[PDB]
């Protein structure tokens, strides 16, 4: 058992990016099962915070 989390921008909106990938990887070529992952609206710090967090 293994999972890959990925994240990508909404090409204009979130739904498009998931559907487009799910079509390629899951509907058509059947290389992986896939679904959305539900990260909430977390509160961003300034840039000098995030470069520490990573």
């Amino acid at each position: 058992t293994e999972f890959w989390l990925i994240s990508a921008p909404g090409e204009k909106t979130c739904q498009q990016t998931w559907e487009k990938l799910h079509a390629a990887t899951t509907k058509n070529n059947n290389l992986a099962v896939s679904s959305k992952f539900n990260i909430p609206d977390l509160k961003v710090g300034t840039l000098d915070v995030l470069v520490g967090l990573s």
Binding site: L5, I6, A8, P9, T17
Partner: protein, 140 residues
């Protein structure tokens, strides 16, 4: 099978002389002196430990099965920070991204790696997208 245990009785001085000359004669003094408190204690203790092991096992297994859950749940929340933070760094500051979970089929890895590269190479191990692996082989 090899040997026997026997009494000797002697004048209280002679213990050192006897045990030395017994070792010279390859006769082995079994160094023990009687106390009924201790001869009771052996028979208490190997029953007691066999009992206390059974008292503790139940609560220990419930504590492990609960705190594995609490530490596993904590792990998935740290992935959910790492995908968030890196998607705020590697994409534009106005937050507009989707996180996705993929579960690869057997032997299919290269084709999937290639498809993801084809889907995202324009955003430019390293990848042109935010990525982290969640294992589940906890028992190694």
């Amino acid at each position: 099978q090899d040997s026997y245990l026997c009494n000797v009785t002697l004048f209280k001085k002679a213990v050192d002389d006897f045990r030395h000359k017994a070792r010279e004669n390859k006769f082995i003094v079994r160094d023990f002196q009687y106390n009924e408190e201790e001869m009771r204690a052996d028979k208490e203790e190997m029953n007691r430990l066999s009992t206390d092991k059974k008292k503790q096992f139940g609560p220990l297994v419930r504590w492990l099965k609960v705190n594995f859950s609490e530490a596993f749940i904590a792990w998935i929340h740290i992935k959910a920070l790492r995908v968030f933070v890196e998607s705020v760094l590697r994409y534009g500051l106005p937050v507009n991204f989707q996180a996705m979970l993929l579960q690869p089929n057997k032997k299919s890895v290269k084709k999937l790696r290639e498809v993801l590269h084809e889907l995202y190479k324009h955003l430019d191990e390293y990848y042109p997208y935010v990525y982290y692996k969640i294992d589940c082989n906890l028992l190694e």
